Every structure is written in structure tokens, then in C-alpha cells.
């Protein structure tokens with residue numbers, strides 16, 4: 425294990441996509457930088473979420489780095505949507521190309537960080553006892569980096585094998601001949617269940633809230649397509665940077681209501697057959713009005729009812745109530761087709777809640793389920809989970825967990841008043857669709873600001889309380905034009921293109937909203 429240095433210009437937490445780029449760029453900018461990563465290697469979510477079927481929901485050609493021309497040319501994506509193993513190879517390939525691991529401390533977790541106004545420096549501590557002093561602290565700790573253990577009664581009494589998709593074994597697990605239970609039907613559960621059902625004797629999928637999922641229609645990547653794209657990859661990426669989703673996507677111009685029944689069915693079957701989340705933008709007001717939303721929602725519901733041979737099973741797979749697209753749209757591969765298998769059973773925990781885990785399995789208010797293995801696909805902590813596991817003290821030793829107790833309050837989602845020289849990558853308050861585009865934009869803005877601080881001899885950068893309140897209010901206001909609040913708003917819904925413009929303007933105006941001092 426590598427030892428974190430005593431002093432550094434910038435200390436980064438996290439060796440996922442965000443922290444690795446920050447490390448690369450701050451090196452290129454002539455700054456001393458170092459990373460602290462709990463995991464044994466690089467990758468972030470793609471190092472932890474090694475469960476079978478883990479797959480990206482953004483097309484390979486978009487979900488990738490663009491800062492390096494060599495990488496864009498030498499790497500060859502193979503499928504429309506990259507599997508977790510491939511994304512990890514891609515990440516390790518970048519870490520190898522640029523010798524990043526020499527500036528990373530693995531097998532180490534940041535536990536405390538306190539800002540000292542006297543020296544304008546952060547003092548960062550780790551569980552292993554290391555103490556690092558850094559002028560700036562970059563939190564690349566992620567949004568879903570804390571696997572959340574569902575507070576199930578009697579969980580410790582389970583006699584079989586317990587797995588969590590967010591911390592999957594680094595050696596493949598063979599479920600052949602087992603009775604397996606999967607708890608959770610989000611992205612993780614929908615992706616891992618079809619893979620497990622190929623091995624297990626009996627698979628029990630425990631679902632509480634049913635969610636929307638459309639077919640991914642994953643396909644090999646035409647190698648000649650990739651060849652032509654590489655001769656124009658920089659232009660293609662700038663295109664992507666000028667979109668609301670940070671990805672190429674057709675923008676439906678027509679209102680979901682003004683169309684006929686046959687036209688709405690044919691347009692949506694088009695998307696349903698083409699696959700992917702682009703169906704979200706089939707019509708311009710899917711996420712703008714409940715009526716347009718429900719019209720597109722019923723079509724998907726009926727596609728479910730038509731795929732599941734058993735109408736009893738189908739109707740509980742059909743989401744109802746909350747609107748379509750308000751939660752990140754899941755892509756499924758043979759998931760709804762799974763429930764037509766004879767070794768798969770859908771357990772509706774809305775009708776029969778889980779009372780306790782037992783030595784032999786899971787006991788709902790209906791029966792006890794005997795399971796050889798239990799797979800928890802129960803998501804992660806909120807976007808603040810990685811930060812709340814750290815004792816973060818700012819001016820006046822006020823802990824961040826307190827100020828953010830009523831929610832995370834930031835300026836631009838990048839900084840928070842009372843906590844200078846601290847920046848969040850891909851955190852709350854910023855756009856979160858194609859995270860690789862948003863991550864590159866965030867790393868560049870932050871490391872540009874840090875280079876700016878060193879260039880001008882300034883040593884303390886702090887967001888202004890009033891602008892923080894203004895930002896929190898603006899983010900809230902733009903949200904009310906959408907159906908998102910129907911589930912301190914954390915997500916910026918304005919779109920990547922408009923957000924980047926905002927951030928560039930702030931930077932082009934001497935970092936308006938910040939207070940730089942020495």
C-alpha cells in the first residue's frame with residue numbers, strides 16, 4: 425500500500441472516473457496532487473459493482489473520457505452499452521497509460537477533514553492513521569459509493585450466502601442448483617436477476633415499488649462505424665457537450681397529447697424497438713405535464729402486460745402512481761421475459777411485507793422462503809452518503825453534516841459556504857444524466873479554478889452564502905416546471921448545456937459567487 429504524502433497542493437478522495445481525471449489534470453497543470461481510495465484499485469462504481477449483468481445505460485461512444493486523443497483512438501468499444509468488466513478494463517487502461525496509480529493511496533479510507541483558517545489548509549485523516557495537509561480538497565467520493573445495507577430484522581441470522589451487488593465478490597459466484605433470493609428491483613436487481621435465473625434452481629425476486637424499465641436492445645458495435653466516428657470524435661463530443669443530456673439524443677418536437685392513438689403507438693413502438701432511454705424524449709412534454717406523461721406511461725404498462733404471460737404477475741410488475749421518467753430510466757435485457765421462466769417467482773412485498781430474515785431465508789407476512797443465497801440489490805445511501813461517513817469540519821469547526829442536515833446547500837453544486845477550498849465532483853445541485861460529460865466538465869472547472877488560485881497567489885476560495893441560497897432557490901424553481909418534484913431539490917434539471925454555460929460565465933467573471941482571499 426502506498427503512503428499518502430505529508431503535504432500536497434490538492435488531495436483527491438476517490439479513484440473512480442472523477443478522481444482519476446482530477447489527478448491527471450492537476451498533474452498536467454503543474455500541481456502536487458494525490459488520491460485516497462478505499463478500494464484496492466481504480467474504477468469506482470465499476471470496481472465495486474461486479475455483479476453479473478452490470479452494464480452501462482449510456483452508449484459506449486458517449487460514456488467515456490474525451491480529454492485524451494490517444495485514448496479515443498486506441499480504445500475499441502465492442503457493444504452499444506459497455507458491460508462493467510469492459511468499463512473497468514477501459515479505466516485500468518487509462519490508469520496504465522498515464523501512470524496514475526503512482527499518485528494514489530489504495531486500501532485507505534478518509535475519515536476526517538478539518539479546515540484551518542490560520543493556514544488556509546485542510547488536515548485530512550484516514551482510518552489507517554495517516555495525516556495529510558492539503559490546500560484544496562476535491563471530493564470525488566461519488567454519488568452512489570456507499571452500499572446501503574437494508575435494515576432488515578434478523579439479517580445476521582441468515583445461514584446461507586449473503587451478497588450485495590454494490591460490493592460483489594471479485595471471483596464469479598456460481599448459483600447453479602441454488603434457491604436464490606434477490607431483494608430490490610432497481611437497475612441493479614433488474615440487471616442481475618436475469619443472469620442469476622440462468623443458474624439457480626429457484627429464483628425469488630422480492631419487489632417493493634415497481635419501476636419502469638425499457639429494453640436496452642444491446643448490440644455489437646459496428647467496427648467500421650467506430651472507425652468513421654474516430655476521425656470526427658472531437659466534433660462529436662462537442663456536439664454532445666451542447667445537449668441537455670450531455671449525450672446525442674433526438675428531441676421530440678410534438679406534444680404527447682396532440683397526437684392520435686395510432687401515431688402515438690407507432691412512434692413509441694419505434695423507440696421500443698430501437699431500444700435505449702431515448703424514448704424519454706419521444707415527445708417534448710413527457711416530463712413537463714402529467715397528462716402527456718401518463719399517456720406515454722400507459723403504453724409502456726401495456727407492453728409489460730403483453731410480455732408477461734401471467735396477467736397476475738404482469739399487473740404487479742406494472743408501475744402505477746408515480747410518473748414515468750421521474751426516476752432514472754432503467755434498461756432491461758430479458759427481465760420481463762424472465763418472469764415467464766418456470767424457476768422465477770415475483771414476490772410482491774407491497775402486499776406481503778418482509779417481517780424478518782431467518783436462518784433459512786426470508787419471512788414475509790405470507791410465508792417463509794427457504795434460500796441458499798440472498799442477494800441484496802437495495803441501492804445505496806443518498807448522494808451525501810460518502811460525505812456523511814466523513815467528519816468534515818469547516819470554518820468555526822462547524823460540521824458539514826449539520827449544515828447539510830436539512831439537505832445539501834451548494835453554489836453550483838461545486839462548493840458550500842463555510843467550507844473553503846473544498847469542491848464536490850458530480851455532486852448535488854449539478855446535472856446528472858451522462859455523468860462522464862458532467863464529470864469532465866466538473867473536473868476541468870475545478871482544476872482550472874485551482875490553477876487560477878495558484879497563478880494569482882490566492883489561497884482561500886469560498887462560495888458566498890447569498891449565492892448559495894440563490895442557487896438553491898433557482899434549482900428549486902426550474903424544477904417546478906417538471907414532474908420531478910412528484911417523488912431542497914438535489915438535481916439540477918436545467919440541462920448540461922445550460923449548466924456549463926452558467927459555470928463558464930461564473931468563471932469568466934472572476935468566479936462570481938466566490939470570495940478569493942489570502
Ligand SMILES: Cc1cc2nc3c(=O)[nH]c(=O)nc-3n(C[C@H](O)[C@H](O)[C@H](O)COP(=O)(O)OP(=O)(O)OC[C@H]3O[C@@H](n4cnc5c(N)ncnc54)[C@H](O)[C@@H]3O)c2cc1C
Nearest residue numbers: 438440441442462468469473480481533534565566569859
Ligand atoms: C452500478 C452503477 C451503474 C452506473 N451506471 C451508470 C451509467 O450507465 N451511466 C452514468 O452516466 N452513470 C452511471 N452510474 C453513476 C456513476 O456514479 C457515475 O457514472 C460515475 O461512475 C461516478 O464516478 P465517480 O468517480 O464520481 O464516483 P465513483 O465511481 O463512485 O467513485 C467514488 C470512489 O470514492 C471512494 N471513496 C468514497 N468515500 C471515500 C473515502 N472517505 N475515502 C476514500 N475513498 C472513498 C469509493 O470507494 C469509490 O471508489 C452508475 C453507478 C453505479 C453504482
Ligand SMILES: NC(=O)c1ccc[n+]([C@@H]2O[C@H](COP(=O)([O-])OP(=O)(O)OC[C@H]3O[C@@H](n4cnc5c(N)ncnc54)[C@H](OP(=O)(O)O)[C@@H]3O)[C@@H](O)[C@H]2O)c1
Nearest residue numbers: 479480481574608609610611612613632633752801802803
Ligand atoms: N446504468 C445501469 O445499468 C445501472 C446499474 C445499477 C445502478 N445504476 C444506478 O445507480 C442507482 C441505484 O441503482 P440500484 O438498483 O442499485 O438501487 P435503487 O435504484 O435505489 O433501487 C433499490 C431497490 O431495492 C429496494 N429496496 C431497497 N431497500 C429495501 C427494503 N428495505 N425492503 C425492500 N426493498 C427494498 C427498492 O424498492 P423501493 O423502490 O420500493 O424503495 C428498490 O426497488 C440508480 O440511480 C441507477 O440509475 C445504474
